[PDB]
Design a protein around this ligand. Structure first.
Ligand code: ADP
Ligand code: MG
Lengths: 446, 584, 454
């Protein structure tokens, strides 16, 4: 039945009723069984890509059967505490899950008017986030990183320290590793076990040397499990995905297999659609208990904010968390630069009844003072740094203490929202009361 | 009709034979599911189709049917207060019928209600010669908005039968005797979104629009039938401006367009708009608004036709003789959708990957807005005011989307990031921004107010510009290096920035400011300047003036919070200023 | 014999393919009759055997391949010419848009025109008193010359355009200019500004206008200059008129050309612009000039906005390579309230040699032309360093130059958008515009004209 075997691809004749992205099964001449996926289908033939590759396949004495169904996920409540493949296969030497049902990994499209206002506060335990760029339930808050930047530890710290206060009913964390090395993959899987965070999390681990079609199926596999736990089990689900850059690169390979002309910067034209189709599988829904919160993580090529991957993402997600090379070289952990970072829904998760009543003001105070203190340091370098204003001098020492003490908290240090706000006041206590943007009734926190 | 047959499914691309009777750019239902597709190419009877939904599970053999038309919109009673998407799918009907919070793949629902009974009030007599645009009757769709049934374009003849009655939008209401024969009319008409609706004549937009936004109406005004662009960095206030304009503009109908858009950001418009009520009518904002809400998750064809879907609807009520304001947020995400299709169609890219016809598409969009004479015997006048937000990367406006936009518009509200961090909203750069309607508007203002208002705005701009020049001297030399007259100008300019330009959109009172309140507020700010100027010339010192005017300057800053029924409490400040300065 | 094919083989984007044809020529004009009565114009891009690849002006949207008709006209894109074009307003394709009496054209002419034999050409030397001294003295215009204005967005080049149209005319002659105006891809309100100005001044009663808007088809924007020039060469070389042609915006023309090129899948040249941009623009600007034994002339004044105020941009650069000089408008001058904001240093005229000394002024102010050039150069270098730094190197040999600039830009070059001054006045003001520089400073060959007037 097999007509051609070109590299990782395959041409199969006698196709009838074969659908796009339908799974196939190959029985080789020696009895080895491999599976594949339809990338392109015509009346006379169909193009498929084998998961296990095409090396050592005899064209003459091999047979192929079509399964009549695409990639599916065996969903169940027993997924909690389990580590899976990029294809949803058990990766942790545990018992096979008895499925409640089998679902499509493409999911459904949420109605734009079916969404609720982002409401609750998610304590990531990191001061740079919770205070200045607050994560809210249902929000899509991404992390923009670069080659060599410690986004690995940041992903591990968030997935470990993230909690919902005070209501702790059905909170889960779905982690998706996409096309990363084994070291980075093992680091995550080990950290989830040692800390006990595995007991409430679901993992889908995909490696760099896995075929590009598996890398593409990985985010769809994880999000399907998440929306299952969210909508059908009413769980508060937080989803973390890295690296999203690997996902975009995988698309280029498949697009070239179908011989599609590359778009801007070498990526397929439908890159915008694909990212949006993944990321917009989140947010609170009217008439649904559970929800999906996403933290997509990506590395910007050449640290370029104008690159398609971070540029398109910003048009989809409500803000971003920036990691800079400057702060990393300074020893700041995490190296979060608060000036270019943003959370567009932070006010929806702060105030009173959530966090504390002094959240918003100190945030605006710390932000204004850090920016001004950062500027005063520039004047010091060019001027004598000896005749600068007495008030300005404190601002410079404030900006330094803000980066080394406040932002640089560590990758294994968990701060409650109260501890974060209290430390903010001790930093604001360096300046006189005449230089604040907080109200006079904020003399209860000094 | 003819039924196609899929021969190839490759990603979002679908090939189908038995399509000889099809036409280019026709909307199609692909596969057994009937997902939304569009014909882009055609060779003999093999059509090339772009599918804007998931093609997973679709293969050769499955049927393909053409809708016999390009992307169009149903225009008739039942369109007001509705929330569609880019391809005009009823989002509310989707949730009520399917009872799900999702958009079912391949689910076809009519945009308007085709079972609802409207009372059609015929207003024309039989035997009358009718042409395109002629009103044959109306429907009271809302308490205020009269939905006028018009003769569709391409129809011309004699009215044979017509009578008032309760019909649906499917029931025939009028029969016109044409050269071809008998033609039935209904309360609904179809129109392609990519084609502009015909007019009798294009006019100049000379009537200023009351937005309530002080910085806008005073210094950079836009006319009814004009166009304004709002570029800027992220978090600068683009959206807030679009909100403020949508709910305060002295306009008959509003067409808001998510291009677009972020998922949790689209939620704001959907929930907030039906909650706002005009005190005069007791009606909600939605009752005069047609909403196009697209998330980034929506099909790219819908995201690309989003602004064309909206302006087609805007044109529809424009022909009826109403003033329509159409909002676009954000056109950069519309252009990004255009850029996506350019790559998917495998075209030759222009600047920055955008299609080479980007400048034309933008030109086509904004030239469909404006004050016009609608078709018909009445020769009535309607207008479309286009206000679009632009989201360039890093706030750099030298990018194609912004530059091409500023080439076809006359109003530019440039957002400044350094201003937004000063809590100076709206963050419009009074130095860089401009309005090419300023002269004509000021002429209109002087007539309707019977004041020297145009001189007030000019003097106001003169002070702000002198502030910019002086601030450089304050940076090179000391603040004590300025004369008392220079010190005064900086204080007057400070009052203009803080008491006038700055406007909180979330404050119950400060969210809106009528034309008269703007006049009185700018009057007392300039009055303080004049009196203090004359005082310095009479031997008074700068410090003595400020120390003795703490209370009255306090009363000036809070004048923005004075209720609209107590405008005299702003005018009385003029006397307090004089008497206070005269004492010193 | 009327030709029409009713079967279309292939439609790929904006491109079409018609089979089983014969006698179809290159660049032939076609018409497509839509099923709803609409008629679209098209153009034959290429012909192989029994096939013809054509492009439709209004696009191929909504076109059926079985229910449509393609009429081949047997001629390229033409223009209907007549005696009664003056006072009328036309389309980008030569169709009436002013709602007056439709004219019956005497004949139809190819809008590509024909190339004038360089031997048959008559070199331009007749001086034109534009009224503007910055032009009249230093960058002198001549009948038959192609002299463009390089400006930028926001700058008053529209005001300068109307000004020149008002007050420009030939000396010691009864000849009055017949103005052919061509708006290219501009907005309605931009086009309305010209329609209003031409009516108030009465310039419409002596003009032909070709108005092409921004949301008109890109092909129509390309055809507009050739439509206007065909009408210009008609009124000049057949009616004997001295035609003044004014086009704006040429930047829009180039952008339309770039869009059309990409639609035809042509590989972009420098900065994404076509490789034939020089050639294409040259088929327009070379249409100017005079002819031996034929009365009348054609004078062009192209107008363009330099993208990002960059002169090295392909559009003004290739324009400068073709045209006989250029008039530059800068924001630095315009910010000083100067109208027109003409910078004479980047400005040039290539035909000012025979125009000067003949029509004016027998070297009276033809001679100072190279001085005010060389003196303003050092006057700017001096003013540059003397403003940012301290005392100038000399208050007689270095700060004296600064004195001869500030007022000689606020006065010598100022003029006015609705203000007209004669050449005599300009050479009058000019000798007084050397304010104030002593006889030591004027390093010219003559001592004669330094004594006649101050
Ligand atoms: N007129 C205003 N009054 C008060 N706050 C404002 C105003 N305009 C903007 N803001 C603040 O600035 C932020 C920017 O909002 P948004 O309009 O979404 O930014 P952009 O659209 O420019 O990205 C908002 O969160 C809002 O709090
Ligand atoms: Mg916004």
């Amino acid at each position: 039945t097999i007509k051609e075997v070109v590299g990782p691809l395959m041409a199969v004749e006698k196709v009838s009723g074969v659908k796009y992205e339908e799974l196939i099964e190959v029985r080789m001449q020696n009895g080895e069984i491999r599976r594949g996926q339809v990338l392109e289908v015509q009346e006379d033939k169909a193009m498929v890509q084998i998961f296990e590759g095409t090396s050592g396949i005899c064209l003459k004495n091999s047979s192929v059967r079509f399964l009549g169904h695409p990639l599916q996920l065996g969903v169940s409540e027993d997924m909690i505490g389990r580590v899976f493949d990029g294809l949803g296969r058990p990766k942790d030497n545990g018992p096979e899950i008895l499925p409640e049902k089998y679902l499509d990994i493409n999911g459904e499209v949420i109605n734009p008017i079916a969404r609720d206002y982002p409401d609750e506060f998610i304590q990531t335990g990191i001061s740079a986030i919770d205070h200045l760029n607050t994560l809210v339930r249902g929000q899509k808050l991404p992390v923009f990183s670069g080659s060599g930047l410690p986004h690995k530890e940041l992903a591990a710290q968030i997935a470990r320290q993230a909690t919902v206060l005070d209501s702790s009913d059905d909170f889960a964390v779905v982690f998706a590793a996409i096309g990363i090395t084994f070291e980075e993959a093992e680091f995550f899987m080990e950290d989830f076990r040692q800390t006990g965070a595995i007991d409430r999390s679901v993992m889908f681990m995909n490696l760099a040397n896995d075929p590009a079609i598996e890398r593409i199926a990985t985010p769809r596999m994880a999000l399907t499990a998440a929306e299952y736990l969210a909508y059908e089990k009413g769980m508060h689900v937080l989803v973390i995905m890295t690296d999203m850059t690997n996902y975009a690169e995988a698309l280029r390979e498949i697009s070239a297999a179908r011989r599609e002309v590359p778009g801007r910067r070498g990526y397929p034209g439908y890159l915008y659609t694909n990212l949006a189709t993944l990321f917009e599988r989140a947010g609170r829904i009217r008439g649904l208990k559970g929800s999906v919160t996403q933290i997509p993580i990506l590395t910007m090529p050449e640290d370029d904010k104008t690159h398609p991957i971070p540029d398109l993402t910003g048009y989809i997600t409500e803000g971003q968390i920036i990691l800079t090379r400057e702060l990393y070289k300074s020893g700041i952990q995490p190296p979060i630069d608060v000036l270019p970072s943003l959370s567009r829904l932070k006010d929806k998760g702060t105030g009173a009844g959530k966090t504390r009543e002094d959240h918003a003001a100190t945030m605006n105070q710390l932000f204004a003072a850090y920016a001004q203190g950062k500027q005063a340091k520039e004047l010091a370098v060019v001027l004598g740094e000896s005749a600068l204003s007495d008030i300005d001098k404190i601002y410079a020492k404030f900006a330094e203490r803000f980066e080394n003490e406040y932002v640089n908290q560590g990758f294994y240090t968990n701060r409650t929202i109260t501890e974060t706000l209290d430390l903010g006041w001790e930093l604001l206590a360096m300046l006189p009361r005449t230089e604040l943007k907080r109200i006079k009734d904020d003399l209860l926190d000094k | 009709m003819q039924i196609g047959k899929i021969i190839k499914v490759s990603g979002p691309l679908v090939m189908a034979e038995n399509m000889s009777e099809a036409c280019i750019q026709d909307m199609c239902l692909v596969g057994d599911l009937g997902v939304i597709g569009e014909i882009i190419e055609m060779r003999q009877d093999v059509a090339s189709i772009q599918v804007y939904e998931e093609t997973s599970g679709i293969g050769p053999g499955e049927p393909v049917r053409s809708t016999g038309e390009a992307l169009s919109v149903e225009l008739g009673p039942g369109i007001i207060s509705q929330m569609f998407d880019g391809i005009q799918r009823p989002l509310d009907t989707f949730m009520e019928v399917t009872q799900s919070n999702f958009l079912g793949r391949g689910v076809q629902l009519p945009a308007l209600d085709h079972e609802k009974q409207w009372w059609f009030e015929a207003t024309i007599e039989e035997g009358t010669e009718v042409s395109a645009g002629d009103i044959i009757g109306y429907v009271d769709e809302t308490k205020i908005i009269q939905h006028k049934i018009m003769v569709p374009n391409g129809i011309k003849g004699t009215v044979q039968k017509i009578e008032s009655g309760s019909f649906t939008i499917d029931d025939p209401i009028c029969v016109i005797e044409t050269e071809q024969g008998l033609k039935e009319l209904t309360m609904m008409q179809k129109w392609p979104v990519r084609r502009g609706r015909p007019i009798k004549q294009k006019l100049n937009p000379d009537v200023p629009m009351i937005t309530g936004q002080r910085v806008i109406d005073t210094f950079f005004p836009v006319t009814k039938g004009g166009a304004a662009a709002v570029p800027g960095p992220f978090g600068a206030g683009k959206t807030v401006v679009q909100h403020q304009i949508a709910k305060w503009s002295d306009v008959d109908l509003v067409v808001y367009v998510g291009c677009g858009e972020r998922g949790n950001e689209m939620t704001d418009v959907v929930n907030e708009f039906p909650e706002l009520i005009d005190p005069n009518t007791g009606e909600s904002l939605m009752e005069r608004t047609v909403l196009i809400a697209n998330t980034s998750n929506m099909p790219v064809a819908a995201r690309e036709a989003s602004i064309y879907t909206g302006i087609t609807i805007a044109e529809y009520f424009r022909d009826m003789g109403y003033d329509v304001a159409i909002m676009a947020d954000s056109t950069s995400r519309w252009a990004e959708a255009l850029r996506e299709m350019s790559g998917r169609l495998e075209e030759m890219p222009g600047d920055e990957g955008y299609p080479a016809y980007l400048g034309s598409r933008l030109a086509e969009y904004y030239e469909r807005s404006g004050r016009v004479i609608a078709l018909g015997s009445d020769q009535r006048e309607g207008s479309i005011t286009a206000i679009s937000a632009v989201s360039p990367s890093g706030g750099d406006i030298s990018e194609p989307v912004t530059q091409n936009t500023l080439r076809v518009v006359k109003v530019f509200w440039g957002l400044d990031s350094s201003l937004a961090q000063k809590r100076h909203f709206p963050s419009i750069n009074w130095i860089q921004s401009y309005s090419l309607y300023s002269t004509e508007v000021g002429r209109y203002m002087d007539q309707i107010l019977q004041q020297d208002w145009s001189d007030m705005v000019t003097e106001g701009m003169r002070i702000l510009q002198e502030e910019e020049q002086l601030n450089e001297i304050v940076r090179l030399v000391g603040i004590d290096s300025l004369s008392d007259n220079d010190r005064l100008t900086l204080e007057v300019a400070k009052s203009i920035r803080e008491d006038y330009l700055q406007q909180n959109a979330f404050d119950d009172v400060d969210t809106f400011t009528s034309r008269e309140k703007q006049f009185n507020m700018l009057k007392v700010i300039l009055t303080f300047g004049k009196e203090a100027r004359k005082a310095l010339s009479l031997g008074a010192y700068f410090n003595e003036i400020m120390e003795g005017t703490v209370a009255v300057r306090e009363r000036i800053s809070r004048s923005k919070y004075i209720p609209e029924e107590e405008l005299a409490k702003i005018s009385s400040i003029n006397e307090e200023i004089k008497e206070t300065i005269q004492l010193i």
